C-alpha cells in the first residue's frame, strides 16, 4: 500500500550518481548505441541497488584502502569499504561507490583518515590509477596508485581517495560510458548490473549529465548517469512495491505548473523519452523543472514527443 | 495533511551536512557550550533551509569562482554559485554550500570547469584559503587563495573548489564549531542562521559526527553537524507542515526492530536527547540504527535517558 513516487526536487539541484557533481543537463544518445552498463547509479523502483551502487552521496566515486609497497615505488592499495568496514571478494563487483570509468586515467587525491595520524602534518597523498593496468584488480580488492606523491608512504596507512579529475589515454578520447574490467573471478552474487537495451516504441534512454573535470572526453567534460543520486536515495528509502510495467512521469515547470515533457521510468531503473524528430529531445528543456509521478502504465504507453524539431 | 517523517536510512549510511563525508557517530557535548550556529545543515521541519544550507549534497563545503590577480601572486576569486548562477551580495550570508569553518586554514583543490578549458592539459589548481585573513569577504563575494599552484592562473578562469583538508592555526587547535566571519554588510534577507540554545528538561543537543581530514582539531578529526544532509533533502522534498511543538523520534535497531533510544527533533531543526547521567549518551549506541517518527509532542515531553551510566 506504499505508493510509488520520485523526489520532487528540481533537476538542476540534483546530483550525479557516478561523480559527486551537480546535474546540469539531460540528453539522449541513441545513435552511438554502445553498451549501457553503468555500475553506479543503478537501482530498481522498489529500491534494490545493483552493481556497486551505494545510497550514500558521499561515497559516489570514492575508494578507500590501506597501503603496501609494490614494485618500482608504486603504492599498492588494499581496498576496504569507505565506511572502513572490510571489503571481501566474491560478493559485489567492487566496494560500494567504487568508480565505474574504465577508459581513462583517474587522477586521485587521498587523505589519511586515522585520527591518530591526523593530529599534525600533511595528510595528502596524490597519484593516478590506471584501470587498464594489469594490476587493477578491484573485485579481488586491490589496485595500484602509479606515481605516488609522496613517493614513500608507510604500510598500512588508511587512505580515502577522491577522483580529482579524469584524463584520456594517449591518442584516444575519454569515453565516460565505458565501465572498468573488475576481474575474472565473477560469482553469481557479485554479478555486474545488467546492460540496458533500447526500450522500443521509439523511446530512447535519457541520461542525466554533469559538467565534470574529465579532460579529453568524447562528451566535452560531461559525465552521464541513468538516475540522479537523489532518486536512488529515494527508492531505497521508500521501498514502494512495483505495481505496473513502467512509471509515467511528467517533468513539470515548478512555478507555472505546466507540463514540460512526458517520460517513462522502468522498473529496472532507467528513464526514457521519445525525442521530437530531428531535435535534441529533452536537452532543450529548462533544467529547473521537477519530475512528478503520474501513474503506472504498461510498456506500450506511447509518449508524446519531447523537445523541438531542430 | 502531509504528515511529517524522517528518512529511514541507517545513520552510518547518511552523510554530514557540513562536509562531504559519511556519518559514523552521534555525540553530545553539553559542557563546552560554545555558540552553536552552524550555517550549513540548517533546515526547519517544514523544509525551509537557513543560512547557507543547500539541498545538494555535492555542494556541501564547495565553492566556485572566477580568478583575478591579487597583490603578491595571491589568487583572488570572485565567487559564484556552484551551479554557475551568479552570486550577488545582500541576499544570503555567502553562496549556497559555502563552508562554515572559521577556525582553521582550508587547503583546497580546485579544477577548471569550463568545457573548452578541459579538452587537454592538467586542470588542477591547489592552494589554501585563510578565513581569518582580512581579504576573506564571502558575503560580498570575494576571497583569496594563498600560495596558488600553479602560480599564475589566467584571469577569469572558472574554478570549482573542494576542501581537501583543514588545519589548525599555529599555537591553536582547530575548533570545528567556529563559523567564519562573513562580513559587516549583513542585511535582514541575508541574516545568519540563528544560534541554538540548550533546550531544557535535561536535554542536550545531539551532533552527528564524521571522521574528516581536519588536522589538529579540538575533536580528534571529527566534524559535527546538526542534521544529516539526507534529513535536509527530506524536509525540503516533503514540505510537511509543523503540527506540534517538537517531533518524537525513536532510534531503532532495524533488525530486532527494538527501540535503542528516544530523541526529540525541534521545529528550528536540531535533535536533542537526555543522556543517562555520567555516560556518553547516544555515543555508545550502534551506528546502524534508523530514526523513525513516532508523534508530535509538546516541549515538556520527558525523554527516557539514552545511553549507559558510564
Ligand atoms: Mg552487492
Ligand atoms: Mg539565504
Author numbering:
A (entry chain B), B (entry chain A): 231 to 540
From the paper:
Noroviruses have been identified as major causative agents of acute nonbacterial gastroenteritis in humans.
However, the molecular interactions between host antigens and the GI.9 capsid protein have not been investigated in detail.
